[PDB]
Design goal:
The structure is a homodimer. Chain A has a 7-stranded parallel sheet with strand order 8-7-6-9-10-11-12. In chain A, strands 2-1-3-4-5 form a 5-stranded parallel sheet. In chain A, helix 4 links the parallel strand 4 and strand 5. Chain A is an alpha/beta fold and 299 residues long. In chain A, 47% of the residues are buried. Chain A folds into 2 domains: 109 residues, Rossmann fold; 190 residues, Rossmann fold (3-Layer(aba) Sandwich). Chain A is elongated, with a radius of gyration of 22 Å. The first copy, chain A, is 38% helix and 16% strand. At the A-B interface, helix 5, helix 6, helix 7 and helix 13 of A face helix 5, helix 6, helix 7 and helix 13 of B. The complex binds nicotinamide-adenine-dinucleotide (2 copies). Chain B: One of its GO terms (biological process) is brain development. Chain B: GO terms for molecular function: electron transfer activity; L-malate dehydrogenase (NAD+) activity; NAD binding; phosphoglycerate dehydrogenase activity. Chain B: This is D-3-phosphoglycerate dehydrogenase.
Chain lengths: 299, 300
C-alpha cells in the first residue's frame, strides 16, 4: 500500500499499480489528515508541498519507505526517518536534462551578456561597445564531473565547436572519450580553459574545488558556471577573481546559503544568477514521477 | 591610396590596408559636416553601422570610388545613389554568421528558462522560485525560416538539444535541407507545429511582416519567437498584440525597425528579452569582418 500526497503525473500511479501495489493519490492535506491516510501504508510519495516531519514519521507505524519526486530532501526529516528505520529515496536521473540545458544557457549568457543587455535595454539604453562578447567556436570548455549532467553538457557544447576536456575520478577515459571528452588531471585543466563548469556532488573533497590557488592557475578572463551545489566554487575566491578580472564572468544557480545573505557576488555586474532553477521544468518534474514510482515497484 | 575608416572597427582592418600600401584615417563619430570634409581627398570609405552614407554624402564626395561595410546588408548605405554615380559597394557576408547563430541559440535558451528575468529578480534582492518555472527544449519543434549561412548553423546546434528542426527556404531544396536535418514544409503547415520560431532571412518586400496577425493566429497558443535577423520581418505591432493576448508567450529581439527604437512597448514587456543589435558583436566576428573587407580593397 502506497500514499501519493502531492500533485504528480498520473503516470506514477499506473506503474505502481502494474507493479502490484495499491495506491491512493491525494494532496494539500493537513498534518492530521496525512497521518490518518498513512495508517494502512508502508510507502509515501511526495514532491515538495508535503512536509514529512518527525511528528508525521512517528505517528505512521507501518511505513518503511518515503519517496521524493525531486532532488534533495528539503521537505523530509531525514534524520527522524533514520531513527525509525525508514528508507528515503530520491530520483537521480529525472532532473539531469533540465540541469544540463540550463548549464548550456548559462554558458551562452556568459559569452554574450544577454541578461545584462536585456536590463540595459529596459532602462532605455543602447550600449553597443559595452556588450562586445566572445564567440564559443574553438574555445575550450572544462567540465568537472562527468556523470549524468556532465556528458549531456559536453555533446551540446560540442555542437558549438567547443573543445571539451574534463576530470572525473570514477569515469574511465574510455567512457569519457565515447562522448568526446578528453580527461586530464586538474592541474593541466585550469590553464587550458576559457570556460569551466561544475557537475560534481558536494563532498569534503569538492568543497572549494575552485579556490584562490586554482583561480591563479586559470587563464586570465576565465568564465565560470555553477549549476551543481553552492560551495564547490569558493564564493570569497570567486569575488576576488571577479574584482581583479582573473574571472571575467560567472553564472550561479546555487549558493552556499539559499537565499544568499551576502549579496556582493549577486550584485556584481559580470555575474548572472538564478534562484536554483536547474530542476524547475514541467518535464523534469514529470520524469521524476515515473523514476520514483518505478523504484517503488522494483522494491 | 587614401581611405577613411569612419566607425569603430577591429584594429586589424587599417593594419592590413596599410600593408596593402594605402593610407588610413580612423575617425569614428562624425557629423554629416565633418564626414564630407574628411572624404574630400579619399577614394575609399569603410563603415560599420553608425555612419550613414546618404545620397547627400555620396554626392559631395568627389573622389570616391569604393564604399565598404564591415557587416551584412547595406542598411546604412544609399546603394541607389552609389550606383548612379558609379561607385561599387562592398560588404562582408561571411564574417559574422557564427556569432549571429550563437546569439540566436542563446536567445532560444533564455526564452525557455527566463534567465534574463531571473537575473533581474535576483539583483532586485528576491528569491522567486515558484515563479520561474520553465521549458525543456528536448522534444520541442523549432521552425527556422531562412536556411542559408545562419539558419543552418542554428539548426545543427539546436538538433544537439533534441529539438525537431523544420523550416522553409525558397531556394534550398528539401533534399539539401534534409542533409542538415531540416525538414522543409510549406509555411502554412509550419505555423501550427512550432514551439519556437526563429527568422534568418534578408529584409525584402516578401519578408516584411512574414510573421503578422494572420500567421500568429495559425500558431500554437504560447509560441516563442526570436528575431536576430532584421527589424520588420516580425511585424512589431502584431508581435505586441500576440504577447498581450498570450498567443505568443515570449520573444527575443536583437533588431528593430528603428535602431535604437523610440517605441518602447515591446522592449518593456515582461516576456520580452532584448539586446542592442549584438549579433555580430564578438571580438572574433569583428576581426573576421575587418579582415574580409580589407582584403577585397587590397585586391582592388
Ligand atoms: N541545479 C539544480 O537544480 C540541480 C538539478 C539536478 C542536479 N544537480 C546537481 O548537479 C550535480 C551533478 O549531478 P549528476 O546527476 O551529474 O551526478 P552524478 O552522480 O551522475 O555524477 C557526478 C560525478 O561527479 C564526479 N566527481 C566527484 N568528485 C569529483 C572531483 N573531485 N572532481 C571531478 N569529478 C568528481 C563523480 O565521479 C561522478 O561521476 C550534483 O551536485 C547534483 O546535486 C543540480
Ligand atoms: N547582428 C545581427 O543580428 C546579424 C548579423 C548578421 C546577419 N544578420 C541577418 O540575418 C539574416 C540572414 O543572414 P544570412 O547570412 O544567414 O543570409 P544568407 O544569404 O546566407 O541567407 C538568407 C536566406 O534567406 C532565404 N530566404 C529568402 N526569402 C525567404 C523567405 N521568403 N522565407 C524564408 N527564407 C527566405 C534565402 O533563400 C537565403 O537562403 C539577414 O537578414 C542578415 O542581415 C543579422
Amino acid at each position: 500500500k502506497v500514499l501519493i500526497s502531492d500533485s504528480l503525473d498520473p503516470c506514477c500511479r499506473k506503474i505502481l499499480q502494474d507493479g502490484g501495489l495499491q495506491v491512493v493519490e491525494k494532496q494539500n492535506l493537513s498534518k492530521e489528515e496525512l497521518i490518518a491516510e498513512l495508517q494502512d501504508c508502508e510507502g509515501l510519495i511526495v514532491r515538495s508541498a508535503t512536509k514529512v516531519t518527525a511528528d508525521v514519521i512517528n505517528a505512521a507505524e507501518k511505513l518503511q519507505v518515503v519517496g521524493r519526486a525531486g532532488t534533495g530532501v528539503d521537505n523530509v526529516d531525514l534524520e527522524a526517518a533514520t531513527r525509525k528505520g525508514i528508507l528515503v529515496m530520491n530520483t537521480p536521473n529525472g532532473n539531469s536534462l533540465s540541469a544540463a540545458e540550463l548549464t548550456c544557457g548559462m554558458i551562452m549568457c556568459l559569452a554574450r551578456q544577454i541578461p545584462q543587455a536585456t536590463a540595459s535595454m529596459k532602462d532605455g539604453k543602447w550600449e553597443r561597445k559595452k556588450f562586445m562578447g566572445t564567440e564559443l567556436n574553438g574555445k575550450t570548455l572544462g567540465i568537472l564531473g562527468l556523470g549524468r549532467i556532465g556528458r549531456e553538457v559536453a555533446t551540446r557544447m560540442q555542437s558549438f565547436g567547443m573543445k571539451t576536456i574534463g576530470y572525473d575520478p570514477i569515469i574511465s577515459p574510455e567512457v569519457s572519450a565515447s562522448f568526446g571528452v578528453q580527461q586530464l588531471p586538474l592541474e593541466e585543466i585550469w590553464p587550458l580553459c576559457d570556460f569551466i563548469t561544475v557537475h560534481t556532488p558536494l563532498l569534503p573533497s569538492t568543497t572549494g574545488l575552485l579556490n584562490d590557488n586554482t583561480f591563479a592557475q586559470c587563464k586570465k578572463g576565465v568564465r565560470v558556471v555553477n549549476c551543481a551545489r553552492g560551495g564547490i566554487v569558493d564564493e570569497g575566491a570567486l569575488l576576488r577573481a571577479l574584482q581583479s578580472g582573473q574571472c571575467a564572468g560567472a553564472a550561479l544557480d546555487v549558493f552556499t546559503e539559499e537565499p544568499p545573505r551576502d549579496r556582493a557576488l549577486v550584485d556584481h555586474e559580470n555575474v548572472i544568477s538564478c534562484p536554483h532553477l536547474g530542476a524547475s521544468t514541467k518535464e523534469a518534474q514529470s520524469r521524476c514521477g515515473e523514476e520514483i514510482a518505478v523504484q517503488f515497484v522494483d522494491m
